[PDB]
Amino acid sequence: RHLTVATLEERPFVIVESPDPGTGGCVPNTVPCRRQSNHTFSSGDLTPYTKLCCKGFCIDILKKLAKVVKFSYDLYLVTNGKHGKRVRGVWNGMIGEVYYKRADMAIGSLTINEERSEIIDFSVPFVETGISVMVSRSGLSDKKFQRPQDQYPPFRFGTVPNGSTERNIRSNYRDMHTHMVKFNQRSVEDALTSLKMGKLDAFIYDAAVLNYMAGKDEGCKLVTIGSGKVFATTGYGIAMQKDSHWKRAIDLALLQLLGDGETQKLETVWLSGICQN
Amino acid sequence: KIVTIHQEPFVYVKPTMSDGTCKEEFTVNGDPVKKVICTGPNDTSPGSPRHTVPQCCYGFCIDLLIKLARTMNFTYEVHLVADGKFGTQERVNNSNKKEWNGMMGELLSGQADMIVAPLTINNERAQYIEFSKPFKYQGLTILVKKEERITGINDPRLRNPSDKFIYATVKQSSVDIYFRRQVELSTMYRHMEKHNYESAAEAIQAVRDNKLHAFIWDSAVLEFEASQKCDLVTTGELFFRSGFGIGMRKDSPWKQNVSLSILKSHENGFMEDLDKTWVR
Amino acid sequence: TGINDPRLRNPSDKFIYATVKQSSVDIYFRRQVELSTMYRHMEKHNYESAAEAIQAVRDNKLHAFIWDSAVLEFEASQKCDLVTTGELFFRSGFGIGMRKDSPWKQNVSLSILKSHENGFMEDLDKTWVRYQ
Ligand SMILES: *[C@@H]1O[C@H](CO)[C@@H](O[C@@H]2O[C@H](CO)[C@@H](O[C@H]3O[C@H](CO)[C@@H](O)[C@H](O)[C@@H]3O)[C@H](O)[C@H]2NC(C)=O)[C@H](O)[C@H]1NC(C)=O
Ligand SMILES: *[C@@H]1O[C@H](CO)[C@@H](O)[C@H](O)[C@H]1NC(C)=O
> What's the sign of the alpha-carbon dihedral B76, B80, B83, B87?
positive
Q: Which DSSP state fits B78? A: B
- Cβ contact A180:A169 at 8 Å: yes
- Cβ contact A260:A126 at 8 Å: no
Residue B126 CB less than 6 A away from ligand 1: no
* C63 touching chain A per CB within 8 A: no
* B26 touching chain A per CB within 8 A: no
- Cβ contact A166:A160 at 8 Å: yes
Closest ligand relative to B257 C-alpha: 1
* C111 touching chain A per CB within 8 A: no
How many Cα atoms occupy the beta-carbon half-sphere of A64 within 13 Å?
16
Contacts of C6 in chain A (CB under 8 A): 215-216, 272-274
Q: How far apart are CA B273 and CA B266, in angstroms?
A: 10
A76-108 burial string, b = 16+ CB within 10 Å, else e? Answer: bbbeebbbbbeeeeebbbbbbbbbeebbbbbbb
Q: Do C10 and A272 touch (CB under 8 A)?
A: yes
> Which residue lies with its CA nearest to atom 8 of ligand 1?
B257
Q: Which DSSP state fits B25? A: -
**What SS3 class is residue C93?**
coil
Cα Rg of chain C (Å, integer): 18
- Cβ contact B112:B249 at 8 Å: no
Q: How far apart are CA C80 and CA C84, in angstroms?
A: 10
**Amino acid at site C55:** Q
How many Cα atoms occupy the beta-carbon half-sphere of C115 within 13 Å?
11
Q: Which DSSP state fits B121? A: P
> B19, B52, B54, B51: which is closest to B36 by C-alpha?
B54
How many other C-beta atoms lie within 10 A of the C-beta of residue B33? Answer: 18
CA distances from B98 to B91, B124, B183 (A): 4, 12, 19
Q: Which helix (H) or strand (E) holds C115?
A: helix C104-118
* A171 touching chain B per CB within 8 A: yes
CA distances from A153 to A144, A149, A176, B3 (A): 11, 9, 16, 54
Burial of B130: CB neighbours in 10 Å, binned 0-12, 13-18, 19+: middle
How many other C-beta atoms lie within 10 A of the C-beta of residue A11? Answer: 15
Q: How far apart are CA A270 and CA B8, in angstroms?
A: 37
Q: How far apart are CA B144 and CA B215, in angstroms?
A: 7
**Amino acid at site A169:** I
Helix axes B60-72, B254-267, angle to 10 degrees: 110
* B86 touching chain A per CB within 8 A: no
**Amino acid at site A49:** Y
> A48, A55, A108, A57: which is closest to A78 by C-alpha?
A108
Q: How far is the CA of B259 from the centre of ligand 1 (A)?
A: 15
CA distances from A42 to A3, A19, A34, A36, A48 (A): 20, 20, 11, 9, 6
Contacts of A235 in chain B (CB under 8 A): 134
- Write the Ramachandran bin of A116: left for phi over 0, alpha for psi from -120 to 50, otherwise beta: alpha
Name B143's Cβ contacts closer than 8 Å, sequence gap at least 6: B204, B207, B214, B215, B216, B217, B222, B225, B226, B232, B233, B234, B235
- Percent helix, strand, coil in chain C, to 5, is 50, 5, 45
Cα Rg of chain B (Å, integer): 19
CA distance to partner chain A, nearest, from residue B240 (Å):
8
- Cβ contact A250:A69 at 8 Å: yes
Residue B75 CB less than 6 A away from ligand 2: no
> Which residue lies with its CA nearest to atom 10 of ligand 2?
B73
- Binding-site residue positions of C for glycine: 24, 68
CA distances from B280 to A234, B28, B117, B243, C1 (A): 22, 11, 21, 21, 38
Closest ligand relative to B74 C-alpha: 2
Cα Rg of chain A (Å, integer): 20
**Resolution to 1 decimal place, in Å:** 4.3
- The DSSP result for chain A, as a single string, is -EEEEEE---TTS-EEE---TTTSS--TT-EEE-----STT---SSSSS--EEEESHHHHHHHHHHHHHT-EEEEEE--SSSS---BTTB--HHHHHHHTTS-SEE-SS-B--HHHHHHSEEEEEEEEEEEEEEE----TTSHHHHSTTTSSSPP--B--SSSHHHHHHHHH-HHHHHHHHTT--S-HHHHHHHHHHTSSSEEEEEHHHHHHHHHH-SS---BSSTTTT-EEEEEEEEEE-TT-THHHHHHHHHHHHHHTTHHHHHHHHHS--SS--
Altogether, the residues listed in chain C come to a count of 132
**What SS3 class is residue B225?**
helix
CA A238 from centre of chain = 12
Q: How far apart are CA A126 and CA B165, in angstroms?
A: 35
How many Cα atoms occupy the beta-carbon half-sphere of C48 within 13 Å?
0
- Cβ contact A115:A86 at 8 Å: yes
* C4 touching chain A per CB within 8 A: no
Helices (H) and strands (E) in chain C, counts: 7, 2
Q: Which DSSP state fits C2? A: T
Question: A with B: 3 or more CB pairs under 8 Å?
Answer: yes
- Which experimental method was this entry solved with? cryo-EM
Q: How far is the CA of B67 from the centre of ligand 2 (A)?
A: 14
- Cβ contact B141:B217 at 8 Å: yes
Helices (H), C6-103: 6-9, 24-31, 36-45, 50-58, 69-79
Q: How far is the CA of B64 from the centre of ligand 1 (A)?
A: 22
* Phi, psi of B195, deg, nearest 5: -125, 15
Name B70's Cβ contacts closer than 8 Å, sequence gap at least 6: none
Cα-Cα-Cα-Cα torsion B249, A118, A111, A202, nearest 10 degrees, comes to -120
Q: Do C34 and A27 touch (CB under 8 A)?
A: no
